[PDB]
Amino acid sequence: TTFEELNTDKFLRRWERERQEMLEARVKMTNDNVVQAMGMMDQLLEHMISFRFSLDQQA
Amino acid sequence: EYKDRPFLPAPFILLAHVHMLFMRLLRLCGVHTQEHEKIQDDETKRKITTFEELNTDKFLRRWERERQEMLEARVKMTNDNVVQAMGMMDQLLEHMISFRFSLDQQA
Amino acid sequence: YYALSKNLGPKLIMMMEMMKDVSTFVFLLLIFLIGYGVAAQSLLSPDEDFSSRTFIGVLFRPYFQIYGELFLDDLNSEANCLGDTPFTECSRETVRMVPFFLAVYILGSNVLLVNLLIAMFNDTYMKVQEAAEDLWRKQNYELCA
Amino acid sequence: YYALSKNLGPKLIMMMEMMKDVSTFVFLLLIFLIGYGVAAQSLLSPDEDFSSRTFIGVLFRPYFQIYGELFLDDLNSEANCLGDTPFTECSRETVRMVPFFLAVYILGSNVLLVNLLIAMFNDTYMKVQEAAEDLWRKQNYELCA
Amino acid sequence: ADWYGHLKSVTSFWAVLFAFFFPFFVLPFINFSGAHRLRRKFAKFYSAPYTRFISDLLSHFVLCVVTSYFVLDKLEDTISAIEWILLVWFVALLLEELRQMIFCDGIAEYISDTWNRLDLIMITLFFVGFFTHASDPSNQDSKVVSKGIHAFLVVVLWLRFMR
Amino acid sequence: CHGSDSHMASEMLHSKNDMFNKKNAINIAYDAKSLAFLSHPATQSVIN
Amino acid sequence: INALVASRILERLSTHRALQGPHLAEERAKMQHNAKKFEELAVGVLGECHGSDSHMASEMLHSKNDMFNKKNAINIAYDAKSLAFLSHPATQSVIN
Amino acid sequence: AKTNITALDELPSFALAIEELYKREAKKPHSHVQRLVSLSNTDVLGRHYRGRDLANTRAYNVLRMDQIFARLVSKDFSVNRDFTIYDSKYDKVPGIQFRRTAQASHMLFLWAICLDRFRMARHFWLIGDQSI
Numbered sequence: 001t002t003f004e005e006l007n008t009d010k011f012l013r014r015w016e017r018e019r020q021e022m023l024e025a026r027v028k029m030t031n032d033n034v035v036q037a038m039g040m041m042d043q044l045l046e047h048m049i050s051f052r053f054s055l056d057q058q059a
Numbered sequence: 060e061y062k063d064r065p066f067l068p069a070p071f072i073l074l075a076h077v078h079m080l081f082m083r084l085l086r087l088c089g090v091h092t093q094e095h096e097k098i099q100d101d102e103t104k105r106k107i108t109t110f111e112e113l114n115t116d117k118f119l120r121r122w123e124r125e126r127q128e129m130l131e132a133r134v135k136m137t138n139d140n141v142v143q144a145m146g147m148m149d150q151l152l153e154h155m156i157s158f159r160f161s162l163d164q165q166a
Numbered sequence: 167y168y169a170l171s172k173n174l175g176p177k178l179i180m181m182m183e184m185m186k187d188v189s190t191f192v193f194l195l196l197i198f199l200i201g202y203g204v205a206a207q208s209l210l211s212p213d214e215d216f217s218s219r220t221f222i223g224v225l226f227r228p229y230f231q232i233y234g235e236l237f238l239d240d241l242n243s244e245a246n247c248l249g250d251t252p253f254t255e256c257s258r259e260t261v262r263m264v265p266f267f268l269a270v271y272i273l274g275s276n277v278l279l280v281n282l283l284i285a286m287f288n289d290t291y292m293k294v295q296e297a298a299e300d301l302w303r304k305q306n307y308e309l310c311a
Numbered sequence: 312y313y314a315l316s317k318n319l320g321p322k323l324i325m326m327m328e329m330m331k332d333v334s335t336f337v338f339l340l341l342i343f344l345i346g347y348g349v350a351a352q353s354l355l356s357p358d359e360d361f362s363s364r365t366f367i368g369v370l371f372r373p374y375f376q377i378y379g380e381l382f383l384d385d386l387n388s389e390a391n392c393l394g395d396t397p398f399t400e401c402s403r404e405t406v407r408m409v410p411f412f413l414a415v416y417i418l419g420s421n422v423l424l425v426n427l428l429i430a431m432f433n434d435t436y437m438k439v440q441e442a443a444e445d446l447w448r449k450q451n452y453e454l455c456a
Numbered sequence: 457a458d459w460y461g462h463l464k465s466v467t468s469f470w471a472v473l474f475a476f477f478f479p480f481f482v483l484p485f486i487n488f489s490g491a492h493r494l495r496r497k498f499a500k501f502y503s504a505p506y507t508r509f510i511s512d513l514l515s516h517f518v519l520c521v522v523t524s525y526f527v528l529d530k531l532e533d534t535i536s537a538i539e540w541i542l543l544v545w546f547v548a549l550l551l552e553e554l555r556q557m558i559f560c561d562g563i564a565e566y567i568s569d570t571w572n573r574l575d576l577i578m579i580t581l582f583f584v585g586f587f588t589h590a591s592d593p594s595n596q597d598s599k600v601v602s603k604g605i606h607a608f609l610v611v612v613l614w615l616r617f618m619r
Numbered sequence: 620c621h622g623s624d625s626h627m628a629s630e631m632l633h634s635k636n637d638m639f640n641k642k643n644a645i646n647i648a649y650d651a652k653s654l655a656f657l658s659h660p661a662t663q664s665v666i667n
Numbered sequence: 668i669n670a671l672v673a674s675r676i677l678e679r680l681s682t683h684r685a686l687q688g689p690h691l692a693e694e695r696a697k698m699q700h701n702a703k704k705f706e707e708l709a710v711g712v713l714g715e716c717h718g719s720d721s722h723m724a725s726e727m728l729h730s731k732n733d734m735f736n737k738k739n740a741i742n743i744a745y746d747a748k749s750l751a752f753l754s755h756p757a758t759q760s761v762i763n
Numbered sequence: 764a765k766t767n768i769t770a771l772d773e774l775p776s777f778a779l780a781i782e783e784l785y786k787r788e789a790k791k792p793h794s795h796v797q798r799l800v801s802l803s804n805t806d807v808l809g810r811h812y813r814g815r816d817l818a819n820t821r822a823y824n825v826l827r828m829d830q831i832f833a834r835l836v837s838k839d840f841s842v843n844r845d846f847t848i849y850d851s852k853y854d855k856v857p858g859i860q861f862r863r864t865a866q867a868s869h870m871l872f873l874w875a876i877c878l879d880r881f882r883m884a885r886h887f888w889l890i891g892d893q894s895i
């Protein structure tokens with residue numbers, strides 16, 4: 001029972017890594033990551049406009 | 060081919076031939092008998108039409124997703140997205156230079 | 167008892183799979199065998215009452231001529247052709263068409279149908295080899311049990 | 312001495328590889344040859360004491376009938392059938408089943424088993440051609456040494 | 457589904473063949489889709505394309521077997537009864553071929569099909585052979601020549617059964 | 620299992636389990652018509 | 668030669684009696700993997716040598732090395748049962 | 764409600780909770796669970812014998828469902844349940860919490876296979892033992 005449960009956990013860990021090492025999965029993650037990078041930058045621009053106004057009303 | 064063919068088997072098909080000739084002679088010259096058929100109702104026709112339009116929409120939705128899930132399409136989108144990300148940053152740098160000048164003339 | 171062997175067991179399942187192609191070949195040949203057999207038997211003996219011997223004559227030679235045993239000496243004796251050339255100086259001129267019919271028949275049976283079976287067998291083998299191996303592995307447990 | 316040639320050497324290794332398929336064919340035919348041979352020899356001579364000649368009769372004709380040499384004239388003489396048709400007007404009615412048994416047998420041996428060997432040979436050739444070429448290249452050094 | 461008509465799709469070749477051969481004993485006890493029930497089941501079963509094909513096969517198979525018997529058995533000194541039956545059968549076949557010629561998409565479409573070509577060759581061969589025998593029925597040479605043309609007739613008929 | 624310890628894996632495949640009418644894993648695999656499981660080398664090694 | 672010997676030692680050790688055992692299995696896979704990698708290296712350099720100067724490459728394959736009992740690279744390759752090395756065209760050209 | 768069957772009264776509380784999950788999922792329109800139980804032609808305890816009030820109010824009990832799954836595996840598959848382990852007298856036995864977990868997990872696993880919910884099925888399959 002102990003041997004079978006361990007090996008079940010070992011196969012699931014090996015299975016998860018192997019599925020994350022596929023080309024399709026890597027392209028899909030990369031794709032989601034570039035989208036998340038834009039979103040972050042977009043938040044960054046929102047901040048920079050707020051700064052621009054702070055100096056603008058500062059002059 | 061075997062839908063329109065007479066039932067009687069070959070040796071006895073002469074009876075079928077004389078029967079078809081008799082019906083043709085009775086219809087063309089005599090004009091006594093006629094043809095009867097059945098016509099589908101409008102309800103069942105609209106039901107078929109509604110089913111076909113829905114399934115057309117369902118195939119187009121499934122087709123669009125499946126074509127967007129291809130490797131080539133994902134690489135192409137990713138490619139366009141990185142280009143759009145630069146363009147945005149480029150706009151961001153344009154702004155930062157404008158700021159630099161605002162502080163520069165501020166000193 | 168051949169099924170326990172790794173070499174022969176799959177081949178016995180493979181043999182049971184080919185049996186369908188063999189049956190397909192039998193149904194296609196049957197057409198040419200009965201057509202040529204009735205035609206050839208009638209041409210050889212055109213003035214004989216139908217009997218059981220007529221039926222045996224329609225199926226005996228035609229079937230065994232597809233394995234290369236061509237009864238041309240026997241056909242020559244039966245045709246009553248006395249010439250040095252095998253089908254010449256015959257009593258009836260119609261019986262001289264017997265070698266031609268035969269000429270068409272073995273073209274249909276040996277050159278066309280036999281080579282077509284070779285092609286089916288090769289195709290069938292490539293299709294069902296992995297399934298035969300898997301089925302042998304299930305039958306291994308069945309035999310053990 | 313054929314092994315030094317690039318054309319023949321691999322084909323000799325290939326020949327040694329097919330020998331297993333030939334052995335598989337021999338084991339599968341052996342079943343039909345002994346079954347048909349004992350049955351046919353017993354049907355032809357049902358009132359004879361067992362001797363060495365009985366054993367020679369069980370293995371002689373059956374083996375050579377799978378190569379197309381069908382001893383039907385010899386079988387007709389041995390069956391004591393006097394009719395113009397080959398298997399008719401016989402002394403015993405059981406011996407008239409001899410051509411049918413034969414009819415099944417050559418269907419089993421020539422149409423089924425021979426075509427199955429052609430299929431194995433084609434499959435075996437495609438599987439072990441690159442390995443045979445590699446093994447010939449190792450044997451090239453072995454012969455040089 | 458169109459092939460089997462108003463009958464259940466689980467029907468096999470032997471089941472439809474047995475029902476065709478034994479109409480009153482297998483039909484009532486079967487599931488499909490009194491006078492107005494037995495009559496409804498007949499009118500539905502025999503109007504099916506599959507049933508007409510099966511009827512056409514059997515008919516052509518009996519034609520092959522009888523014509524084969526006719527060419528193997530010796531010809532009589534007059535026109536025999538089986539010869540008259542075959543004469544009626546091949547006229548009927550000729551009329552069916554003419555009906556197929558009229559009710560199609562042109563003469564070219566009909567003659568493109570190889571089975572139609574086989575039908576013409578077999579009608580042409582039979583009548584040549586029949587008229588050869590019927591010109592002089594007591595002549596031995598006429599019977600020999602007639603069986604010679606009818607050998608070709610049997611070959612084309614068994615070839616056409618592959619359809 | 621066969622990768623980690625082949626002998627113990629064989630012991631697990633030979634083990635009779637009380638929950639399923641006192642039958643081992645190969646008997647249930649045969650009853651489940653799992654051709655993929657039966658053709659696996661680990662299973663074949665136990666059968667041999 | 669060192670890559671061929673390395674390939675042979677890892678492949679034979681991987682199937683040796685000291686690594687034979689029901690639990691001694693994952694380890695075994697890794698060796699075979701390392702063995703083929705080294706085999707690949709031996710083939711690859713050989714290929715590079717034949718690409719650069721074929722005659723000198725033949726001279727290297729014919730060279731007797733004192734460290735390994737005065738035997739050339741093909742003799743060690745045959746002794747290491749490296750079928751991939753022996754089937755290579757450079758090796759075949761020297762044998763011819 | 765109390766039942767005259769002695770097998771049904773032995774059942775624990777969690778078994779009644781799965782029975783509630785089967786009942787709640789079953790009342791939805793065009794549910795395949797109702798068709799599966801109705802077309803089986805079996806009684807309340809799952810025996811192939813084909814009064815009415817118990818057989819209908821508690822038609823989605825765990826024992827019958829075990830019998831239906833047993834018929835869907837093969838003709839001699841019979842899942843053995845032991846609910847006697849849930850009594851408080853067997854708490855001192857070492858490892859008992861895993862065994863109690865394992866069976867509980869098994870019965871929800873089966874429920875999750877029936878409703879074709881792969882993620883909870885995978886989760887209950889992992890929680891329990893006898894994985895293959």
Ligand SMILES: CC(C)CCC[C@@H](C)[C@H]1CC[C@H]2[C@@H]3CC=C4C[C@@H](O)CC[C@]4(C)[C@H]3CC[C@]12C
Pocket residue numbers: 259260262263266
């Ligand atoms: C349409 C295809 C199958 C070709 C048909 C060819 C047929 C019509 C030919 C080929 C060989 C021919 C035979 C060859 C020789 C002779 C001998 C002669 O003294 C009488 C005619 C006879 C017996 C011929 C009859 C017609 C024949 C059988």
Ligand SMILES: CC(C)CCC[C@@H](C)[C@H]1CC[C@H]2[C@@H]3CC=C4C[C@@H](O)CC[C@]4(C)[C@H]3CC[C@]12C
Pocket residue numbers: 253254262263264265266269
């Ligand atoms: C490559 C192949 C197809 C070549 C064709 C061979 C054909 C044309 C040959 C082979 C055997 C021949 C037959 C052999 C003997 C006879 C009997 C003679 O009394 C008339 C001609 C006839 C009937 C021949 C007709 C032509 C024939 C059928």
Ligand SMILES: CC(C)CCC[C@@H](C)[C@H]1CC[C@H]2[C@@H]3CC=C4C[C@@H](O)CC[C@]4(C)[C@H]3CC[C@]12C
Pocket residue numbers: 404405407408411
């Ligand atoms: C089950 C499969 C193999 C088919 C079996 C067919 C067997 C039973 C048939 C096929 C041919 C038959 C033979 C054909 C003709 C004759 C001549 C007759 O005067 C006596 C019976 C006898 C000798 C038959 C015996 C039975 C027979 C051998």
Ligand SMILES: CC(C)CCC[C@@H](C)[C@H]1CC[C@H]2[C@@H]3CC=C4C[C@@H](O)CC[C@]4(C)[C@H]3CC[C@]12C
Pocket residue numbers: 192193195196199222225226229398399407408409410411414
């Ligand atoms: C396509 C193939 C399979 C067609 C089938 C051919 C079979 C049915 C034929 C070929 C040879 C025939 C045999 C040839 C001769 C004889 C001897 C006779 O006294 C009884 C019938 C008997 C025993 C025949 C039985 C039927 C037979 C076996």
Ligand SMILES: CC(C)CCC[C@@H](C)[C@H]1CC[C@H]2[C@@H]3CC=C4C[C@@H](O)CC[C@]4(C)[C@H]3CC[C@]12C
Pocket residue numbers: 259260577581601604605608
């Ligand atoms: C399309 C195919 C089927 C056409 C076949 C044509 C057949 C039916 C015809 C064409 C030539 C004919 C042959 C021509 C001449 C003779 C010689 C005569 O003394 C006996 C009949 C015999 C031997 C004829 C038999 C029938 C024959 C073979």
Ligand SMILES: [Ca+2]
Pocket residue numbers: 553556571572575
């Ligand atoms: Ca037609």
Ligand SMILES: [Ca+2]
Pocket residue numbers: 005008888889890891892894
């Ligand atoms: Ca687990």
